[PDB]
CSV table of C-alpha atoms and ligand atoms in Angstrom, one decimal:
chain,number,residue,atom,x,y,z
A,1,UNK,CA,12.0,38.2,-15.7
A,2,UNK,CA,10.2,34.8,-14.7
A,3,UNK,CA,7.6,34.1,-12.3
A,4,UNK,CA,5.8,31.1,-11.7
A,5,UNK,CA,3.2,31.3,-9.2
A,6,UNK,CA,1.2,28.1,-7.6
A,7,UNK,CA,-2.4,27.1,-6.9
A,8,UNK,CA,-4.9,30.5,-6.9
A,9,UNK,CA,-7.9,28.5,-6.9
A,10,UNK,CA,-10.0,31.8,-7.2
A,11,UNK,CA,-8.3,33.8,-4.9
A,12,UNK,CA,-7.7,37.3,-7.1
A,13,UNK,CA,-7.4,40.4,-4.7
A,14,UNK,CA,-4.5,37.8,-3.5
A,15,UNK,CA,-2.9,37.4,-7.4
A,16,UNK,CA,-2.9,40.7,-8.5
A,17,UNK,CA,-1.3,42.0,-4.8
A,18,UNK,CA,1.7,39.7,-5.5
A,19,UNK,CA,2.1,40.1,-9.1
A,20,UNK,CA,2.0,44.3,-7.8
A,21,UNK,CA,4.6,43.2,-5.3
A,22,UNK,CA,6.9,41.3,-8.2
A,23,UNK,CA,5.8,44.6,-10.8
A,24,UNK,CA,4.5,42.2,-12.9
A,25,UNK,CA,4.9,43.8,-16.2
A,26,UNK,CA,3.3,41.7,-19.6
A,27,UNK,CA,5.7,42.0,-22.8
A,28,UNK,CA,8.4,42.1,-20.1
A,29,UNK,CA,8.0,39.6,-17.8
A,30,UNK,CA,6.9,36.0,-18.2
A,31,UNK,CA,3.6,34.1,-15.7
A,32,UNK,CA,3.9,30.7,-15.7
A,33,UNK,CA,0.7,29.1,-13.6
A,34,UNK,CA,0.2,25.5,-11.5
A,35,UNK,CA,-3.8,25.6,-12.4
A,36,UNK,CA,-6.0,25.1,-10.6
A,37,UNK,CA,-7.4,28.7,-11.1
A,38,UNK,CA,-10.8,28.2,-9.9
A,39,UNK,CA,-12.9,27.0,-7.4
A,40,UNK,CA,-12.8,27.3,-3.3
A,41,UNK,CA,-12.0,31.2,-3.6
A,42,UNK,CA,-14.7,33.7,-4.2
A,43,UNK,CA,-12.7,34.8,-7.6
A,44,UNK,CA,-13.4,32.6,-10.0
A,45,UNK,CA,-14.3,34.6,-12.3
A,46,UNK,CA,-12.5,37.1,-12.4
A,47,UNK,CA,-9.3,35.1,-11.9
A,48,UNK,CA,-10.3,33.1,-15.8
A,49,UNK,CA,-11.1,36.5,-17.2
A,50,UNK,CA,-7.6,37.8,-16.1
A,51,UNK,CA,-5.3,35.0,-17.4
A,52,UNK,CA,-7.0,34.9,-20.9
A,53,UNK,CA,-6.9,38.4,-21.1
A,54,UNK,CA,-2.8,37.8,-20.7
A,55,UNK,CA,-2.4,35.9,-23.4
A,56,UNK,CA,0.7,34.9,-24.4
A,57,UNK,CA,2.5,36.8,-21.3
A,58,UNK,CA,1.7,33.6,-19.1
A,59,UNK,CA,1.8,30.0,-19.2
A,60,UNK,CA,-0.9,27.9,-17.8
A,61,UNK,CA,-1.4,24.5,-17.1
A,62,UNK,CA,-4.9,22.9,-16.2
A,63,UNK,CA,-5.0,21.2,-12.8
A,64,UNK,CA,-7.7,18.8,-11.5
A,65,UNK,CA,-10.2,21.4,-10.1
A,66,UNK,CA,-10.1,23.6,-13.7
A,67,UNK,CA,-11.3,19.5,-15.3
A,68,UNK,CA,-13.7,19.2,-12.1
A,69,UNK,CA,-15.1,23.1,-13.3
A,70,UNK,CA,-15.5,22.1,-17.3
A,71,UNK,CA,-16.7,18.7,-16.4
A,72,UNK,CA,-20.3,20.5,-14.1
A,73,UNK,CA,-20.1,23.6,-17.5
A,74,UNK,CA,-20.1,20.0,-19.9
A,75,UNK,CA,-23.4,18.9,-17.2
A,76,UNK,CA,-21.2,15.7,-16.6
A,77,UNK,CA,-20.5,16.4,-12.8
A,78,UNK,CA,-22.8,18.1,-10.1
A,79,UNK,CA,-21.8,21.1,-8.8
A,80,UNK,CA,-20.6,21.1,-5.3
A,81,UNK,CA,-21.4,24.4,-3.3
A,82,UNK,CA,-18.3,24.7,-1.3
A,83,UNK,CA,-16.2,25.0,-4.4
A,84,UNK,CA,-18.2,28.8,-5.2
A,85,UNK,CA,-18.2,28.2,-9.2
A,86,UNK,CA,-21.6,29.3,-9.7
A,87,UNK,CA,-20.7,32.6,-10.3
A,88,UNK,CA,-18.5,31.6,-12.9
A,89,UNK,CA,-20.7,29.1,-14.4
A,90,UNK,CA,-23.7,32.0,-14.7
A,91,UNK,CA,-21.8,34.5,-16.0
A,92,UNK,CA,-22.2,35.5,-19.5
A,93,UNK,CA,-19.2,35.3,-20.4
A,94,UNK,CA,-19.0,31.0,-19.5
A,95,UNK,CA,-19.0,29.9,-22.7
A,96,UNK,CA,-15.6,31.8,-23.6
A,97,UNK,CA,-13.8,31.6,-20.4
A,98,UNK,CA,-14.1,27.8,-20.1
A,99,UNK,CA,-13.7,27.4,-23.8
A,100,UNK,CA,-10.3,29.2,-24.0
A,101,UNK,CA,-10.0,26.7,-21.1
A,102,UNK,CA,-10.6,23.8,-22.0
A,103,UNK,CA,-7.7,24.5,-24.9
A,104,UNK,CA,-4.6,25.1,-22.1
A,105,UNK,CA,-1.9,22.4,-21.5
A,106,UNK,CA,-1.4,20.4,-19.4
A,107,UNK,CA,3.2,20.3,-19.3
A,108,UNK,CA,4.9,23.1,-20.4
A,109,UNK,CA,8.3,23.2,-21.1
A,110,UNK,CA,10.9,25.6,-22.2
A,111,UNK,CA,14.1,24.2,-22.8
A,112,UNK,CA,16.5,27.2,-22.3
A,113,UNK,CA,15.6,26.9,-18.3
A,114,UNK,CA,16.1,23.2,-18.6
A,115,UNK,CA,12.3,23.9,-17.0
A,116,UNK,CA,9.3,21.1,-16.6
A,117,UNK,CA,6.0,22.7,-14.9
A,118,UNK,CA,2.7,20.2,-14.5
A,119,UNK,CA,0.3,20.4,-12.1
A,120,UNK,CA,0.7,17.4,-9.9
A,121,UNK,CA,4.3,16.7,-11.0
A,122,UNK,CA,6.0,14.2,-13.6
A,123,UNK,CA,5.8,10.9,-12.4
A,124,UNK,CA,9.4,9.5,-12.2
A,125,UNK,CA,7.2,6.2,-14.9
A,126,UNK,CA,7.3,8.6,-17.6
A,127,UNK,CA,10.9,9.7,-19.5
A,128,UNK,CA,9.8,13.2,-21.2
A,129,UNK,CA,9.3,12.1,-25.2
A,130,UNK,CA,6.8,9.9,-23.2
A,131,UNK,CA,5.0,13.1,-21.2
A,132,UNK,CA,5.0,15.2,-24.3
A,133,UNK,CA,3.5,12.7,-26.0
A,134,UNK,CA,0.5,12.1,-23.1
A,135,UNK,CA,-0.2,15.2,-22.5
A,136,UNK,CA,-0.9,15.8,-26.1
A,137,UNK,CA,-3.0,13.3,-26.4
A,138,UNK,CA,-5.2,14.0,-23.3
A,139,UNK,CA,-5.1,17.7,-24.3
A,140,UNK,CA,-6.3,16.9,-28.1
A,141,UNK,CA,-9.8,15.0,-26.6
A,142,UNK,CA,-10.5,18.2,-24.1
A,143,UNK,CA,-9.9,20.9,-26.9
A,144,UNK,CA,-12.0,18.2,-29.1
A,145,UNK,CA,-15.9,19.1,-29.9
A,146,UNK,CA,-16.8,15.4,-28.1
A,147,UNK,CA,-14.6,16.8,-25.1
A,148,UNK,CA,-17.3,15.3,-22.0
A,149,UNK,CA,-17.1,11.8,-23.2
A,150,UNK,CA,-13.6,12.5,-21.9
A,151,UNK,CA,-14.4,13.9,-19.6
A,152,UNK,CA,-17.2,11.4,-17.7
A,153,UNK,CA,-14.3,8.8,-19.2
A,154,UNK,CA,-11.6,10.9,-17.1
A,155,UNK,CA,-13.0,9.8,-13.5
A,156,UNK,CA,-11.8,6.1,-11.8
A,157,UNK,CA,-8.6,5.9,-9.4
A,158,UNK,CA,-7.4,3.2,-12.2
A,159,UNK,CA,-4.9,1.7,-14.1
A,160,UNK,CA,-2.4,3.3,-11.7
A,161,UNK,CA,1.1,2.1,-13.4
A,162,UNK,CA,2.1,3.1,-16.6
A,163,UNK,CA,2.6,1.5,-19.8
A,164,UNK,CA,3.6,1.9,-23.3
A,165,UNK,CA,0.7,-0.6,-23.7
A,166,UNK,CA,-1.6,0.5,-21.5
A,167,UNK,CA,-4.7,1.8,-24.1
A,168,UNK,CA,-8.0,3.2,-24.3
A,169,UNK,CA,-10.0,4.6,-21.3
A,170,UNK,CA,-7.4,2.9,-18.9
A,171,UNK,CA,-4.6,5.1,-20.8
A,172,UNK,CA,-6.3,8.3,-20.4
A,173,UNK,CA,-7.8,8.1,-16.8
A,174,UNK,CA,-4.3,7.4,-15.7
A,175,UNK,CA,-2.7,10.5,-18.1
A,176,UNK,CA,-5.1,12.6,-16.0
A,177,UNK,CA,-4.3,10.7,-12.7
A,178,UNK,CA,-0.6,11.7,-13.7
A,179,UNK,CA,-0.7,15.2,-14.4
A,180,UNK,CA,-3.5,16.5,-12.4
A,181,UNK,CA,-3.9,14.0,-9.0
A,182,UNK,CA,-0.3,12.3,-7.6
A,183,UNK,CA,1.0,13.4,-4.7
A,184,UNK,CA,2.4,9.5,-3.7
A,185,UNK,CA,4.0,6.3,-5.2
A,186,UNK,CA,4.7,3.3,-4.2
A,187,UNK,CA,8.7,2.3,-4.5
A,188,UNK,CA,7.9,1.6,-8.4
A,189,UNK,CA,6.6,4.7,-8.9
A,190,UNK,CA,3.1,3.2,-8.8
A,191,UNK,CA,0.6,5.6,-8.4
A,192,UNK,CA,-1.0,6.5,-4.9
A,193,UNK,CA,-5.0,7.4,-5.5
A,194,UNK,CA,-5.4,8.1,-2.0
A,195,UNK,CA,-3.2,9.5,0.5
A,196,UNK,CA,-3.1,13.5,0.5
A,197,UNK,CA,-1.4,13.5,3.9
A,198,UNK,CA,2.1,15.7,4.3
A,199,UNK,CA,5.5,13.1,3.6
A,200,UNK,CA,6.4,12.9,7.0
A,201,UNK,CA,2.2,11.1,8.2
A,202,UNK,CA,2.1,9.0,4.6
A,203,UNK,CA,1.6,4.7,5.9
A,204,UNK,CA,4.6,2.9,4.5
A,205,UNK,CA,6.1,1.8,1.3
A,206,UNK,CA,4.6,5.3,0.2
A,207,UNK,CA,7.2,8.0,-0.9
A,208,UNK,CA,6.9,11.0,-2.6
A,209,UNK,CA,6.6,10.9,-6.3
A,210,UNK,CA,9.6,13.7,-6.5
A,211,UNK,CA,11.3,11.0,-4.1
A,212,UNK,CA,11.4,8.2,-6.9
A,213,UNK,CA,14.4,9.3,-9.1
A,214,UNK,CA,12.7,9.9,-12.3
A,215,UNK,CA,14.6,10.3,-15.8
A,216,UNK,CA,13.0,14.0,-16.6
A,217,UNK,CA,13.5,15.5,-12.6
A,218,UNK,CA,17.5,13.9,-13.6
A,219,UNK,CA,17.2,16.6,-16.2
A,220,UNK,CA,14.8,19.4,-15.5
A,221,UNK,CA,13.4,21.2,-13.1
A,222,UNK,CA,10.5,20.9,-12.3
A,223,UNK,CA,7.6,23.5,-10.9
A,224,UNK,CA,4.3,21.6,-9.7
A,225,UNK,CA,1.6,23.0,-7.2
A,226,UNK,CA,-1.5,20.6,-6.5
A,227,UNK,CA,0.2,19.1,-2.6
A,228,UNK,CA,-0.8,21.7,-0.4
A,229,UNK,CA,-0.1,19.3,2.6
A,230,UNK,CA,3.2,19.2,1.4
A,231,UNK,CA,3.1,23.2,2.4
A,232,UNK,CA,6.0,24.0,-0.4
A,233,UNK,CA,8.5,22.0,2.4
A,234,UNK,CA,10.7,19.3,1.8
A,235,UNK,CA,11.4,19.0,-1.9
A,236,UNK,CA,15.1,17.7,-3.5
A,237,UNK,CA,16.9,20.1,-5.1
A,238,UNK,CA,15.6,21.5,-8.8
A,239,UNK,CA,12.0,20.1,-7.5
A,240,UNK,CA,9.6,23.0,-6.8
A,241,UNK,CA,6.4,23.1,-4.6
A,242,UNK,CA,4.6,26.1,-5.5
A,243,UNK,CA,1.0,25.6,-4.2
A,244,UNK,CA,1.6,26.9,-0.5
A,245,UNK,CA,-2.8,26.8,0.2
A,246,UNK,CA,-3.3,30.3,-0.3
A,247,UNK,CA,-7.3,29.3,-0.7
A,248,UNK,CA,-6.8,27.8,2.4
A,249,UNK,CA,-5.4,30.4,4.6
A,250,UNK,CA,-1.9,29.1,3.2
A,251,UNK,CA,-0.3,32.2,1.5
A,252,UNK,CA,0.3,32.6,-2.2
A,253,UNK,CA,3.8,31.8,-3.7
A,254,UNK,CA,5.6,33.7,-6.1
A,255,UNK,CA,9.1,31.8,-7.2
A,256,UNK,CA,11.5,34.4,-9.9
A,257,UNK,CA,13.1,32.1,-11.6
A,258,UNK,CA,16.7,34.6,-12.8
A,259,UNK,CA,17.2,34.4,-9.3
A,260,UNK,CA,15.1,31.9,-7.7
A,261,UNK,CA,13.4,34.7,-5.2
A,262,UNK,CA,10.1,34.1,-3.1
A,263,UNK,CA,7.7,36.8,-2.8
A,264,UNK,CA,4.4,35.6,-0.8
A,265,UNK,CA,1.5,36.9,-0.9
A,266,UNK,CA,-1.1,36.3,2.6
A,267,UNK,CA,-4.0,34.5,2.2
A,268,UNK,CA,-6.8,37.3,3.3
A,269,UNK,CA,-9.0,34.0,4.7
B,301,LIG,MN1,-4.9,20.4,-7.2
B,302,LIG,MN1,-4.8,23.2,-5.5
């Protein structure tokens, strides 16, 4: 069976309880994770140890808190007490876990399932070929020896409009924001980097990225996490918002692909 779970955010106990509920069995089953494996919850260290141990039985995409963790590790960004990352950063296997983390994809595609996964979704300004090229470009910088330079360059809210003519720092920053921070779009598909509210509470003319017809979403199902205030609700057919805010006292959600059956684990917070 194929299981898809939203943002774990260090909620190790809930993750294991949910996987036990569905009898997740490596070798028989595959797990997809929407990223943001770490921060806020208490068990980022155990989460990374477990997910890394799953090997080919897990298909992960990186989220914005995963990238921030890598930025802290690399000395680029300051550790925020509320993220609760110190046990992981101080762990003796921190290097092994974080060097594995930075080699993971931004984008997962399964053609037989016609299924796409990224942390925040697929901007309607991208077709599938472009999304693939952009993921490959940022994965290449993240997996390279020079990744701290990229991580430093990633921060920024501009440019917020895609063009194949984008070059250099602006190009990387857009790609990063689109894959890992996107929620709302302007009518022309340009990213808004400020509103984190639910679609009903957002100011006009902002609409959810998935409310704008895009070429990927017209052909593929898209699973994503990230947007907790969406509460997994309000999406079109073929769009699966899996982040139901476990670290926030919400729930951890697991979707079984074959029958589209949902399983839920209540937060322990
Ligand atoms: Mn996120
Ligand atoms: Mn998140």
